[PDB]
Structures are given as C-alpha cells and as structure tokens.
C-alpha cells in the first residue's frame, strides 16, 4: 500500500518505509518509486525513506488534464510542477529541511527543487543528471534529443503511411491532402499526435471489427454505398464492390476522392440530394 498527498491537479502517491530523517527519492524515466524499494530496505533503520511516483506515473493520478501546451518541447510546466510536488511532500512530512536524491530526469526535478524551494532542502544529491542546458556544447546534445524524438513520434509514421497509401492504392490527391502539414508548429504537433492515436487505437480495432454481410442484408433498403470518382482503384472501393456483389446494395458514384466531401462539396451535395432530398 502507498501513501497519498492530494495536491493541485494530482493525487501524489509514494512509498514510505523506515524511521529517521526524511529522505525523498525522485525517480527518472521509469517515473515510479518502486525502483528504490530494495535501496529503502537498506536505509530504513536510518531514514524515513520516501519513494515517489511522480504525478504522471504509476499509482499517482492527475485530477485535471495536462495543459495543451505540455506537448511543446520548450514547456516547463511539468518539471516545475514535479519540483513543487517534492517541496509540498517534504513540508507535509517534516518541519525540518529534508534529504533528497534524484536520478536521471529525477535529478533534474531535484535541481528545480533546490532552485525554487531551497527552504525544504537539507542536503541534495544529483545522480547522473542528463540536463544539457548549461553545457558549453548544449546545442549538440539538445538537437540530438530533439531529432530522436522527432524520428519516433513523427518520421516513422510518415514513412509507414506512405507505404500504407501504396498498399491501399490511395489516390495522390487524397494522400497529399491527408498529409498536408499544418501551417503552425503547434498544429503539426497535433496532427502527428492524432495520427499516432488513430494508429494505436482505431485502424486495427475498427477495420477488423465484427460486421458481417448479414448485418447489411437485414436493412438493405436503407443502405447506399458511395465510391468517389477521383479515388478509383483504391482499396475502399473494392470493399464496396464486394458488398454490392454479395448483397445487391447499390453503389452510387460521387465526386471527389476519399476526401470528396471537402474537395467537391457542391457535386458531393448534388448526389446526396438526389439520393435523399
């Protein structure tokens, strides 16, 4: 069982083991304090060992969404909020300044605790910090971090989606429109996030969901299949051809390609009005 400290925007969960002065361990990229529990066992007759799940990880829980801007690479919201969490935790557990150790990005949180809340620090240890900002070659290291994130979060998708368009023989006009970069960096961040979400949570689950031809035949009088005139040869049209061949449900051709409703709204509307008006 873990302890809870309720703070602005999160329930902060932590392990607490031992007796003595408070010693707070701040984890790095794993984000959870359980990685310190073997160490806590070694220290528990000397310190009250406090091993934190930082608020975005483990058994901690946000009570309010992150700011939209947190995905921006120069946001400082999260590191400042993590540092304030440690300061409030220290104050909640001790009337004296406490001992603090962070490792990896947890040591960067520790630096911000010292910077913004020196009053809670008795002694502090930075174990293998990967901060580059004050290095004489900061640019070199910053750009490497930026580029490897960009590779995983945006470039893998870009290359895979081009192949996927070929698999499905998507028309070039649709591929260009579906991949057209937004005109702001924030808009582009959001575009890539949305595609990464659709990849993980939508494409497989929806395209192999439990629909049978029998589901259509029960209500065939209500159904129209639509094929774009500018997306001939693409996989979705083959799906409609199969439905039609097996069920007789009609195919209506409609202007534009996969994105025809915004490519050719007037012609698209004219067909819908013919169908249903």
Contacts with ligand YW0 by CB under 6 A: the residue count is: 20
- 68 binds, options Mg ion, ligand YW0, a second copy, none, Cβ within 5 to 8 A by partner type: none
Q: Please report how close the Cβ of residue 154 comes to Mg ion at its closest, in angstroms.
A: 5
Residues 150-169 that bind ligand YW0 (CB under 6 A): 154, 157-158, 161-162, 168
Q: Residue 99: exposed, middle, or buried by beta-carbon count in 10 A (0-12, 13-18, 19+)?
A: buried
- Indicate whether 274 belongs to the interface with Mg ion (CB under 5 A): yes
Round to whole Å and give the CA distance between 241 and 220.
Answer: 15
Round to whole Å and give the CA distance between 24 and 246.
Answer: 67
Q: Please report how close the Cβ of residue 44 comes to a second copy at its closest, in angstroms.
A: 10
Q: Please report how close the Cβ of residue 150 comes to Mg ion at its closest, in angstroms.
A: 6
Using an 8 Å Cβ cutoff, are 127 and 107 in contact?
yes
Q: Which residues of 184-206 are buried (b: 16+ CB within 10 A; e: fewer)?
A: eeeeebebbeebeeeeeeeeeee
Site string for Mg ion, 215-254 (x = CB under 5 A): ----------------------------------------
Among the listed residues 92, 176, 79, the one whose alpha carbon sits nearest the alpha carbon of residue 133: 79
Round to whole Å and give the CA distance between 19 and 226.
Answer: 71
β-strands 98-103, 61-62 pairing: unpaired
- Indicate whether 28 belongs to the interface with ligand YW0 (CB under 6 A): yes
Q: Of the two residues 213 and 275, which places its CB atom closer to Mg ion in the complex?
A: 275
Site string for ligand YW0, 221-240 (x = CB under 6 A): ---------------x----
Tokens read off for 119: 């009053």
- 163 binds, options ligand YW0, a second copy, Mg ion, none, Cβ within 5 to 8 A by partner type: a second copy
Q: Please report how close the Cβ of residue 274 comes to Mg ion at its closest, in angstroms.
A: 4
Per DSSP, the three-state class of 26 is: strand
Site residues for ligand YW0 per CB under 6 A: 28-29, 104-105, 130, 154, 157-158, 161-162, 168, 178-179, 191-192, 195, 203, 207, 236, 258
């Amino acid at each position: 069982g873990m302890e809870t400290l309720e703070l602005q925007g999160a329930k902060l969960r932590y392990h607490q083991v031992g007796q003595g002065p408070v010693l707070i361990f701040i984890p790095g990229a794993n984000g959870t304090g359980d990685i310190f529990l073997p160490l806590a066992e070694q220290l528990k007759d000397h310190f009250t060992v406090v091993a934190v799940d930082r608020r975005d990880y483990g058994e901690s829980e946000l009570t309010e969404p992150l700011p939209d801007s947190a995905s921006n690479p120069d946001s400082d919201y999260r590191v400042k909020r993590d540092a304030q969490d440690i300061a409030e935790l220290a104050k909640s557990l001790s009337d004296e300044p406490v001992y603090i150790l962070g490792s990896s990005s947890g040591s960067i949180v520790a630096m911000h605790v010292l910077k913004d809340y020196p009053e809670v620090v008795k002694k502090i240890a930075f174990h293998e910090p990967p901060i580059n900002t004050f290095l004489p070659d900061s640019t070199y290291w910053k750009d490497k971090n930026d580029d490897i994130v960009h590779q995983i979060l945006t470039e893998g998708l870009e290359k895979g989606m081009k192949t996927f368009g070929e698999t499905l023989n998507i028309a070039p006009i649709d591929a260009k429109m579906m991949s057209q970069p937004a005109d702001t960096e924030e808009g582009r961040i959001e575009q890539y996030k949305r595609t990464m979400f659709w990849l993980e949570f939508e494409i497989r689950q929806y395209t192999h969901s439990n629909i049978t031809l029998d589901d259509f035949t029960k209500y065939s009088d209500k159904i129209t299949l639509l094929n774009g005139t500018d997306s001939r040869g693409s996989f979705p049209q083959d799906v409609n051809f199969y439905i039609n061949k097996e069920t007789g449900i009609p195919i209506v051709d409609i202007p534009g390609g996969h994105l025809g409703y915004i490519q050719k709204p007037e012609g698209f509307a004219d067909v819908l009005l013919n169908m249903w008006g």
